[PDB]
Design an enzyme around this catalytic site. Structure first.
Site, PDB file in Angstrom:
ATOM      1  N   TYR A   1      -4.135  -5.661 -10.890  1.00 43.70           N
ATOM      2  CA  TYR A   1      -3.181  -6.602 -10.312  1.00 43.70           C
ATOM      3  C   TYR A   1      -1.833  -6.518 -11.036  1.00 43.70           C
ATOM      4  O   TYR A   1      -0.771  -6.494 -10.402  1.00 43.70           O
ATOM      5  CB  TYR A   1      -3.710  -8.034 -10.403  1.00 43.70           C
ATOM      6  CG  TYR A   1      -4.877  -8.382  -9.489  1.00 43.70           C
ATOM      7  CD1 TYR A   1      -4.702  -8.500  -8.104  1.00 43.70           C
ATOM      8  CD2 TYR A   1      -6.152  -8.624 -10.011  1.00 43.70           C
ATOM      9  CE1 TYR A   1      -5.765  -8.823  -7.270  1.00 43.70           C
ATOM     10  CE2 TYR A   1      -7.223  -8.963  -9.179  1.00 43.70           C
ATOM     11  CZ  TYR A   1      -7.027  -9.059  -7.815  1.00 43.70           C
ATOM     12  OH  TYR A   1      -8.092  -9.381  -6.988  1.00 43.70           O
TER      13      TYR A   1
ATOM     14  N   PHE B   1       0.410  -3.283 -10.027  1.00 40.46           N
ATOM     15  CA  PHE B   1       0.924  -3.332  -8.669  1.00 40.46           C
ATOM     16  C   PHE B   1       1.874  -4.490  -8.428  1.00 40.46           C
ATOM     17  O   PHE B   1       2.758  -4.387  -7.588  1.00 40.46           O
ATOM     18  CB  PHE B   1      -0.218  -3.355  -7.666  1.00 40.46           C
ATOM     19  CG  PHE B   1      -0.976  -2.067  -7.608  1.00 40.46           C
ATOM     20  CD1 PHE B   1      -0.325  -0.881  -7.291  1.00 40.46           C
ATOM     21  CD2 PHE B   1      -2.336  -2.034  -7.884  1.00 40.46           C
ATOM     22  CE1 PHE B   1      -1.021   0.306  -7.239  1.00 40.46           C
ATOM     23  CE2 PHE B   1      -3.040  -0.841  -7.843  1.00 40.46           C
ATOM     24  CZ  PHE B   1      -2.385   0.324  -7.512  1.00 40.46           C
TER      25      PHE B   1
ATOM     26  N   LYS C   1       7.525  -3.980  -2.137  1.00 37.92           N
ATOM     27  CA  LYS C   1       6.470  -4.568  -1.307  1.00 37.92           C
ATOM     28  C   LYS C   1       6.611  -6.082  -1.173  1.00 37.92           C
ATOM     29  O   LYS C   1       6.486  -6.626  -0.072  1.00 37.92           O
ATOM     30  CB  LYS C   1       5.076  -4.211  -1.816  1.00 37.92           C
ATOM     31  CG  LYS C   1       3.973  -4.515  -0.809  1.00 37.92           C
ATOM     32  CD  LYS C   1       2.609  -4.379  -1.447  1.00 37.92           C
ATOM     33  CE  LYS C   1       2.305  -5.549  -2.368  1.00 37.92           C
ATOM     34  NZ  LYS C   1       0.867  -5.600  -2.754  1.00 37.92           N
ATOM     35  N   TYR C   2       6.892  -6.760  -2.281  1.00 34.54           N
ATOM     36  CA  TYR C   2       6.919  -8.214  -2.241  1.00 34.54           C
ATOM     37  C   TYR C   2       8.169  -8.745  -1.556  1.00 34.54           C
ATOM     38  O   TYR C   2       8.070  -9.631  -0.700  1.00 34.54           O
ATOM     39  CB  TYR C   2       6.682  -8.808  -3.626  1.00 34.54           C
ATOM     40  CG  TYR C   2       5.334  -8.386  -4.176  1.00 34.54           C
ATOM     41  CD1 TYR C   2       4.146  -8.929  -3.664  1.00 34.54           C
ATOM     42  CD2 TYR C   2       5.240  -7.401  -5.161  1.00 34.54           C
ATOM     43  CE1 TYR C   2       2.906  -8.522  -4.140  1.00 34.54           C
ATOM     44  CE2 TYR C   2       4.005  -6.994  -5.646  1.00 34.54           C
ATOM     45  CZ  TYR C   2       2.844  -7.554  -5.135  1.00 34.54           C
ATOM     46  OH  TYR C   2       1.628  -7.148  -5.623  1.00 34.54           O
TER      47      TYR C   2
ATOM     48  N   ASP D   1     -14.608 -15.749   0.508  1.00 31.81           N
ATOM     49  CA  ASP D   1     -14.291 -14.707   1.448  1.00 31.81           C
ATOM     50  C   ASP D   1     -13.632 -15.304   2.678  1.00 31.81           C
ATOM     51  O   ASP D   1     -14.089 -16.320   3.195  1.00 31.81           O
ATOM     52  CB  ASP D   1     -15.559 -13.964   1.867  1.00 31.81           C
ATOM     53  CG  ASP D   1     -15.261 -12.581   2.427  1.00 31.81           C
ATOM     54  OD1 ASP D   1     -14.710 -12.472   3.545  1.00 31.81           O
ATOM     55  OD2 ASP D   1     -15.571 -11.595   1.733  1.00 31.81           O
TER      56      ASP D   1
ATOM     57  N   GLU E   1      -2.341  -8.716   2.486  1.00 34.14           N
ATOM     58  CA  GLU E   1      -2.059  -7.334   2.112  1.00 34.14           C
ATOM     59  C   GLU E   1      -3.394  -6.671   1.727  1.00 34.14           C
ATOM     60  O   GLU E   1      -3.766  -6.607   0.537  1.00 34.14           O
ATOM     61  CB  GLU E   1      -1.038  -7.291   0.983  1.00 34.14           C
ATOM     62  CG  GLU E   1      -0.462  -5.920   0.690  1.00 34.14           C
ATOM     63  CD  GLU E   1      -1.435  -5.003  -0.040  1.00 34.14           C
ATOM     64  OE1 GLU E   1      -1.329  -4.893  -1.274  1.00 34.14           O
ATOM     65  OE2 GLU E   1      -2.305  -4.379   0.611  1.00 34.14           O
TER      66      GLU E   1
ATOM     67  N   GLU F   1      -9.392  -0.028   3.575  1.00 33.26           N
ATOM     68  CA  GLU F   1      -9.882  -1.156   2.797  1.00 33.26           C
ATOM     69  C   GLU F   1     -10.363  -2.248   3.742  1.00 33.26           C
ATOM     70  O   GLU F   1     -10.573  -3.379   3.334  1.00 33.26           O
ATOM     71  CB  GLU F   1      -8.848  -1.659   1.772  1.00 33.26           C
ATOM     72  CG  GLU F   1      -8.739  -0.754   0.535  1.00 33.26           C
ATOM     73  CD  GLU F   1      -7.817  -1.290  -0.555  1.00 33.26           C
ATOM     74  OE1 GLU F   1      -7.462  -2.495  -0.548  1.00 33.26           O
ATOM     75  OE2 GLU F   1      -7.436  -0.505  -1.448  1.00 33.26           O
TER      76      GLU F   1
HETATM   77  O1  LIG Z   1      -2.807   4.070  -3.493  1.00 35.92           O
HETATM   78  C1  LIG Z   1      -3.454   3.634  -4.455  1.00 35.92           C
HETATM   79  N1  LIG Z   1      -4.540   2.847  -4.325  1.00 35.92           N
HETATM   80  C2  LIG Z   1      -5.020   2.369  -3.020  1.00 35.92           C
HETATM   81  C3  LIG Z   1      -4.855   0.829  -2.979  1.00 35.92           C
HETATM   82  O2  LIG Z   1      -4.963   0.332  -1.639  1.00 35.92           O
HETATM   83  C4  LIG Z   1      -3.489   0.422  -3.546  1.00 35.92           C
HETATM   84  N2  LIG Z   1      -3.283  -1.025  -3.447  1.00 35.92           N
HETATM   85  C5  LIG Z   1      -1.842  -1.275  -3.645  1.00 35.92           C
HETATM   86  C6  LIG Z   1      -1.534  -2.739  -3.581  1.00 35.92           C
HETATM   87  C7  LIG Z   1      -2.421  -3.474  -4.384  1.00 35.92           C
HETATM   88  C8  LIG Z   1      -2.043  -4.768  -4.775  1.00 35.92           C
HETATM   89  C9  LIG Z   1      -2.884  -5.541  -5.577  1.00 35.92           C
HETATM   90  C10 LIG Z   1      -4.113  -5.038  -5.993  1.00 35.92           C
HETATM   91  C11 LIG Z   1      -4.507  -3.760  -5.608  1.00 35.92           C
HETATM   92  C12 LIG Z   1      -3.671  -2.966  -4.805  1.00 35.92           C
HETATM   93  C13 LIG Z   1      -4.123  -1.687  -4.460  1.00 35.92           C
HETATM   94  C14 LIG Z   1      -3.079   3.909  -5.781  1.00 35.92           C
HETATM   95  C15 LIG Z   1      -1.722   3.905  -6.151  1.00 35.92           C
HETATM   96  C16 LIG Z   1      -1.380   4.164  -7.490  1.00 35.92           C
HETATM   97  N3  LIG Z   1      -0.093   4.170  -7.887  1.00 35.92           N
HETATM   98  C17 LIG Z   1       0.290   4.324  -9.310  1.00 35.92           C
HETATM   99  C18 LIG Z   1       0.253   2.997 -10.055  1.00 35.92           C
HETATM  100  O3  LIG Z   1       1.585   3.315 -10.565  1.00 35.92           O
HETATM  101  C19 LIG Z   1       1.801   4.265  -9.481  1.00 35.92           C
HETATM  102  N4  LIG Z   1      -2.353   4.412  -8.399  1.00 35.92           N
HETATM  103  C20 LIG Z   1      -3.703   4.416  -8.033  1.00 35.92           C
HETATM  104  N5  LIG Z   1      -4.038   4.151  -6.707  1.00 35.92           N
HETATM  105  N1  LIG Z   2     -12.458 -10.513   2.922  1.00 38.69           N
HETATM  106  C1  LIG Z   2     -11.714 -11.043   1.907  1.00 38.69           C
HETATM  107  N2  LIG Z   2     -11.659 -12.378   1.663  1.00 38.69           N
HETATM  108  C2  LIG Z   2     -10.919 -12.873   0.646  1.00 38.69           C
HETATM  109  N3  LIG Z   2     -10.184 -12.100  -0.184  1.00 38.69           N
HETATM  110  C3  LIG Z   2     -10.150 -10.753  -0.050  1.00 38.69           C
HETATM  111  C4  LIG Z   2     -10.943 -10.155   1.025  1.00 38.69           C
HETATM  112  N4  LIG Z   2     -10.759  -8.825   0.952  1.00 38.69           N
HETATM  113  C5  LIG Z   2      -9.914  -8.591  -0.091  1.00 38.69           C
HETATM  114  N5  LIG Z   2      -9.565  -9.735  -0.698  1.00 38.69           N
HETATM  115  C6  LIG Z   2      -8.636  -9.831  -1.845  1.00 38.69           C
HETATM  116  O1  LIG Z   2      -7.348  -9.477  -1.331  1.00 38.69           O
HETATM  117  C7  LIG Z   2      -6.525  -8.928  -2.365  1.00 38.69           C
HETATM  118  C8  LIG Z   2      -5.822  -7.684  -1.802  1.00 38.69           C
HETATM  119  C9  LIG Z   2      -4.703  -7.137  -2.687  1.00 38.69           C
HETATM  120  N6  LIG Z   2      -4.285  -5.816  -2.232  1.00 38.69           N
HETATM  121  C10 LIG Z   2      -3.502  -8.055  -2.610  1.00 38.69           C
HETATM  122  C11 LIG Z   2      -3.266  -8.726  -3.961  1.00 38.69           C
HETATM  123  C12 LIG Z   2      -2.052  -9.650  -3.973  1.00 38.69           C
HETATM  124  N7  LIG Z   2      -1.945 -10.413  -2.738  1.00 38.69           N
HETATM  125  C13 LIG Z   2      -0.833  -8.809  -4.144  1.00 38.69           C
HETATM  126  O2  LIG Z   2      -0.230  -8.411  -3.117  1.00 38.69           O
HETATM  127  O3  LIG Z   2      -0.483  -8.552  -5.315  1.00 38.69           O
HETATM  128  C14 LIG Z   2      -7.468  -8.604  -3.523  1.00 38.69           C
HETATM  129  O4  LIG Z   2      -7.197  -9.450  -4.653  1.00 38.69           O
HETATM  130  C15 LIG Z   2      -8.859  -8.827  -2.957  1.00 38.69           C
HETATM  131  O5  LIG Z   2      -9.749  -9.321  -3.956  1.00 38.69           O
END
Ligand SMILES: O=C(NC[C@H](O)CN1CCc2ccccc2C1)c1cc(NC2COC2)ncn1
Ligand SMILES: Nc1ncnc2c1ncn2[C@@H]1O[C@H](C[C@@H](N)CC[C@H](N)C(=O)O)[C@@H](O)[C@H]1O
Lengths: 625, 310
Positions: A312, A315, A321-322, A407, A423, A432
């Site tokens: 977390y 990212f 993104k935000y 969930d 997201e 995902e």
């Molecule tokens: O594309 C990658 N992972 C697939 C995921 O769907 C990426 N998302 C991105 C948004 C997000 C936000 C909160 C928590 C988890 C995630 C995961 C990926 C990129 C990467 N980028 C490097 C980190 O610094 C550049 N590294 C390893 N994996």
């Molecule tokens: N079916 C679901 N119900 C509730 N939460 C979920 C589900 N699927 C995924 N998540 C959560 O959704 C988040 C997806 C992240 N990519 C987004 C994290 C955060 N919103 C960010 O943008 O930094 C993760 O923390 C997951 O644990």
């Protein structure tokens, strides 16, 4: 700075020579390990019994210097593929001997030429050596862009140089490499030392080579032009290739003698250093992506597993993104509550998968920008992140935010939403399982409710890359199908690859989904016009998403959001490389499949030849529901 | 042991050439051990060689000696491992050997040099695939030719024409050159594409006849205008590395090989003599100017052998 070496075919005194080249600025030296003219006999007497020593002593250098500073060169007289039997046999024995000596010395690399079409025996002997004993040494195959025969001066009266162009003929050099490394079963120890000529070949070649494992580029002094001040420089077009090679991160090798006597030798090198520190600097993306080139990451389980705190954290740093989400919520609010209503109407907003809160904060910032009023739910299934959220709620957000720990497919909402924000996207958009999640959550969106995001589309493009094909091959594990590694997609910062065709849309999902009967399964056929000769090793995956109206996110290279490191491309490999010819069409077929427990992709190439259907039944990879 | 002369002569004898006054020129390389260099030697007493104490002159070259030749009567032209062609000029007392020029023009080992008929120019062949024409007087490259597609094995100036020379390479081409033509080279012989050509000798009388040896141990006799293989013989069990015609009226041909033997053949390529006196590669042959039946060979066995020929 650039890392570089001197190629030499003459070394009277090893200690002096190493010192001279060190002073000139070189990082290493390529030199014979036996005297290049010292032909040895192995079979018939008396020459068989030539008193030794066979070459000079290991004691002349420290072990450390052998391991770091020397690259060995095979003897130019060694011809394993000669037509003469006795020469073949002696060359085999000599080849073994020279390679064993480099392994004995602990040399980090060793150069062998590909300078003709037939290298069958050379390959066989090298393969045998690779599979004997234990050593880590690289083998650099010295191969030219342009074959020597096709570079010869047009000066033989009765053997003209056939000026009519051959599209294929001018690629003969790559086919030399390709056959060689195929015979050697893509050994990760066999890399390319690409020799650049004075006349660059046609463009089409250069593109492909850059998908291959180039470890070194060899620059003969004779290809250098000479400027106003009498210094060595390069043509504009040679600069281009150099810049590409730098982006790739190869080592540079200066070969031949000084062709500008009026200056020191290090002048050639000074020019390379020049071009290097004259590249465009790392952009915002390339700073974050810097350590990840061609590093395969295995499939994530978004539902069955919980993200780690540091995941977390990294990212949350995304520069775009935000703020893009903030803007989408900003626009949506304005459109849903008119000016006169700005105080009577309090919109209900639900962040679905709230992580550690950045999209909750973005929501709040969007309201305090549109000057409108919102009630927030923050739903999150990761109880560990729920810890962060609930501490945020108590110290800061107050009652404006209701944190829900569950969930989104399970939660019984107390009231319906005006907008759901989420997201949930993978590199391939829906990998995902964003569809399944929002489908199960939509019952609590109002009949005119907006979903951010509103839609997403995945894209695919065929690619060539031995380096990545090998990376995958190397993911074989004990205790599972010996080919399972080829039947799953990897997130990877694709770097050493050639993209064979422009991306094309694959699957698309809309939210909300007012489909009478909802079905997230998919089947799609893609036709990819290819215009070079090459080898298909897999398909890069990308995506695009509409958050709201014109507010978007993308990792599709053509429309890539600037600075957005959050998603790398995905890679779908194939079990077996497939040969593609200039003019041919690559046809691939992808299915999205599912049952009540899991979702998976299956795929197959059906033109120009068929592959096996990959991942049937989800046997090698699924994403759990 | 003379002034400026090395105490030790490196083991690998590469070349042996008699001057017209009867004295013997030697080139040698260190092909193994710590130092990979080379040396040049003069022996007014031919029977004294290879003995360092009883030589007339001697000098160290920076790198090994791949080939050499006499230039006139006092000049020595050298093909170096360093990529350099160098000219060493003999002392007036003929007791020092002094560098005249050393030009680094090739990009790899220089494997072969020949002096042209006039004695004012020379041609060199390299592993860098180039052939080069030199003005010896002005110490420069006049012409640089990239005719070949693999390393150049041998270059031989015609006896009498200053612009004509043979060359051969591992691209399986034997080229007849004539620098008066706009396209200077012409592919010859090898009537059916054969085994790679490894050695060349012009006929010392019929300026339009030559012999070539190949990697498979065959010596062949070529007519330039006819361009058919007039005669050939399997003379050796391995690569033929040199071919040397006698100064005789009816000239004999000395053939030398990596099979460690010397052979001598008549004009129809029949075997007259054979010596297995060497126990390593035979590298040069030179016929006595003073006695046309004496012939001197050198090898990597460091033997200087004098043969008597019927
Ligand atoms: O594309 C990658 N992972 C697939 C995921 O769907 C990426 N998302 C991105 C948004 C997000 C936000 C909160 C928590 C988890 C995630 C995961 C990926 C990129 C990467 N980028 C490097 C980190 O610094 C550049 N590294 C390893 N994996
Ligand atoms: N079916 C679901 N119900 C509730 N939460 C979920 C589900 N699927 C995924 N998540 C959560 O959704 C988040 C997806 C992240 N990519 C987004 C994290 C955060 N919103 C960010 O943008 O930094 C993760 O923390 C997951 O644990």
């Amino acid at each position: 700075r650039v890392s570089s070496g001197r190629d030499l075919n003459c070394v009277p005194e090893i200690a002096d020579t190493l010192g001279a080249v060190a002073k000139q600025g070189f990082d290493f030296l390529c030199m014979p390990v036996f005297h290049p003219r010292f032909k040895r006999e192995f079979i018939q007497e008396p020459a068989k019994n030539r008193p030794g020593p066979q070459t000079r002593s290991d004691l002349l250098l420290s072990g450390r210097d052998w391991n770091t500073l020397i690259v060995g060169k095979l003897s130019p007289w060694i011809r394993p593929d000669s037509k003469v039997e006795k020469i073949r046999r002696n060359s085999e024995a000599a080849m073994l001997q020279e390679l064993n000596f480099g392994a004995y010395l602990g040399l980090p690399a060793f150069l062998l030429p590909l300078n003709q079409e037939d290298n069958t025996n050379l390959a066989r002997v090298l393969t045998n050596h690779i599979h004997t004993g234990h050593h880590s040494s690289m083998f650099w195959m010295r191969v030219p862009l342009v074959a020597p025969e096709d570079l010869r001066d047009d000066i033989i009266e009765n053997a003209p140089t056939t000026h009519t162009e051959e599209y294929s003929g001018e690629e003969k050099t790559w086919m030399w490499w390709h056959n060689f490394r195929t015979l050697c079963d893509y050994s990760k120890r066999i890399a390319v030392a690409l020799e650049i000529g004075a006349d660059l070949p046609s463009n089409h070649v250069i593109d492909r080579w850059l998908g291959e494992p180039i470890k070194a580029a060899i620059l003969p002094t004779s290809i250098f032009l000479t400027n106003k001040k009498g210094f060595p420089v390069l043509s504009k077009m040679h600069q281009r290739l150099i810049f590409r090679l730098l982006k790739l991160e190869v080592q540079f090798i200066i070969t031949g003698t000084n062709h500008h006597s009026e200056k020191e030798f290090c002048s050639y090198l000074q020019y390379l250093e020049y071009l290097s520190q004259n590249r465009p600097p790392p952009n915002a993306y390339e700073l974050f992506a810097k350590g990840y080139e061609d590093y395969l990451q295995s499939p994530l389980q978004p539902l069955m597993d919980n993200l780690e705190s540091q995941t977390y954290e990294v990212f949350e740093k995304d520069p775009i993104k935000y703020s893009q989400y903030q803007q989408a919520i900003y626009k949506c609010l304005l459109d849903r509550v008119p000016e006169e209503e700005k105080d009577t109407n309090v919109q209900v907003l639900m962040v679905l998968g709230a992580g550690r809160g950045p999209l909750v904060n973005a929501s709040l910032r969007a309201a305090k920008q549109a000057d409108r009023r919102i009630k927030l739910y923050a739903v999150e299934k990761n109880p560990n992140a729920v810890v962060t959220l609930e501490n945020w709620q108590f110290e800061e957000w107050g009652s404006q935010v209701t944190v829900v720990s569950s969930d989104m497919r399970e939660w019984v909402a107390p009231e319906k939403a005006d907008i759901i924000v989420s997201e949930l996207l993978g590199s391939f958009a829906d990998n995902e399982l964003s569809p399944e999640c929002l489908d199960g959550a939509q019952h609590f969106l109002k009949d005119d409710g907006v979903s951010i995001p509103g839609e997403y589309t995945s894209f695919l493009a065929p690619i060539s890359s031995s380096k990545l094909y090998n990376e995958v091959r190397a993911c074989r594990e004990k205790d599972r199908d010996p080919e399972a590694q080829f039947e799953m997609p990897y997130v990877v910062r694709l770097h050493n690859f050639h993209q064979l065709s422009a991306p094309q849309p694959c699957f698309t999902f809309s939210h909300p989904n007012r489909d009478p009967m909802i079905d997230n399964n998919r089947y799609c056929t893609l036709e990819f016009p290819v215009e070079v000769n090459t080898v298909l090793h897999g398909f890069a995956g990308y995506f695009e998403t509409v958050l709201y109206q014109d507010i978007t996110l993308s990792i599709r290279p053509e429309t890539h959001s600037p600075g957005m490191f959050s998603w790398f491309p995905i890679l779908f490999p194939i079990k077996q490389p497939i040969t593609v010819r200039e003019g041919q069409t690559i046809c691939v077929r992808f299915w999205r499949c599912s049952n009540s427990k899991k979702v998976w992709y299956e795929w197959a190439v059906t033109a120009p030849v068929c592959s096996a259907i990959h991942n049937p039944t989800g046997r090698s990879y699924t994403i759990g529901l | 042991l003379p002034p400026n002369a090395p105490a030790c002569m490196e083991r690998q004898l590469e070349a042996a050439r008699y001057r017209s006054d009867g004295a013997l020129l030697l080139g040698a390389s260190s092909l193994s051990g710590r130092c990979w260099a080379g040396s040049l030697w003069l022996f007014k007493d031919p029977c004294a060689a290879p003995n360092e104490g009883f030589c007339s002159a001697g000098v160290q070259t920076e790198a090994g000696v791949a080939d050499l030749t006499w230039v006139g009567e006092r000049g020595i032209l050298v093909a170096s491992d360093s990529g350099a062609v160098e000219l060493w000029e003999l002392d007036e007392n003929e007791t020092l050997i002094v560098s005249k020029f050393c030009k680094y023009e090739h990009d790899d080992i220089v494997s072969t040099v020949s002096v042209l008929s006039s004695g004012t120019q020379a041609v060199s062949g390299s592993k860098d695939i180039c052939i080069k024409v030199w003005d010896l007087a002005q110490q420069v490259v006049l012409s640089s030719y990239r005719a070949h597609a693999a390393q150049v094995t041998c270059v031989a100036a015609s006896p009498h024409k200053d612009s004509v020379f043979l060359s051969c390479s591992e691209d399986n081409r034997i080229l007849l050159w004539d620098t008066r033509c706009p396209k200077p080279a012409s592919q010859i012989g090898c009537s059916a594409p054969g085994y790679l050509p490894t050695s060349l000798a012009w006929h010392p009388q019929q300026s339009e006849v030559f012999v070539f040896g190949d990697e498979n141990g065959t010596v062949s006799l070529v007519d330039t205008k006819s361009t058919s293989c007039v005669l050939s013989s399997a003379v050796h069990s391995q690569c033929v590395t040199g071919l040397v015609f006698s100064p005789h009226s009816v000239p004999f041909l000395a053939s030398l090989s990596e099979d460690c033997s010397l052979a001598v053949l008549d004009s129809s390529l029949s075997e007259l003599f054979r010596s297995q006196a060497h126990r390593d590669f035979v590298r040069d042959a030179t016929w006595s100017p003073l006695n046309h039946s004496l012939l001197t060979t050198v090898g990597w066995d460091h033997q200087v052998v004098h043969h008597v020929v019927p």
